[PDB]
Amino acid sequence: KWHELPLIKCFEIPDLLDPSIIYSDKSHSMNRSEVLKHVRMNPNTPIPS
């Protein structure tokens, strides 16, 4: 039953002022709208990242 108790905060999120804690040199996706736009306009090229 320990999960049914009224638990509260016990850990403080650090201050992510500096990068290199979150951001790095990698590739990600793009928003759905621009994906659909590229598919309609440019259906003959791979969707970039």
Binding site: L36, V39, P46
Partner: protein, 49 residues
């Protein structure tokens, strides 16, 4: 899994097969390169949990 169940999976090598349908993509070649929503995880995400 609320994000996985509500998200759109797509392979960005073959936009020739997918087509836009009401703010989401559908397959038109019987190859299933994309789909809408799922209840399973992907590599590199929530490994720790």
């Amino acid at each position: 899994h609320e994000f996985f169940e509500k998200s759109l999976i797509y392979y960005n090598g073959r936009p020739d097969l997918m087509r836009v349908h009401n703010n989401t993509l559908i397959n038109s070649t019987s190859q299933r390169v994309c789909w809408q929503g799922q209840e399973g995880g992907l590599e590199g995400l929530r490994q720790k949990g």
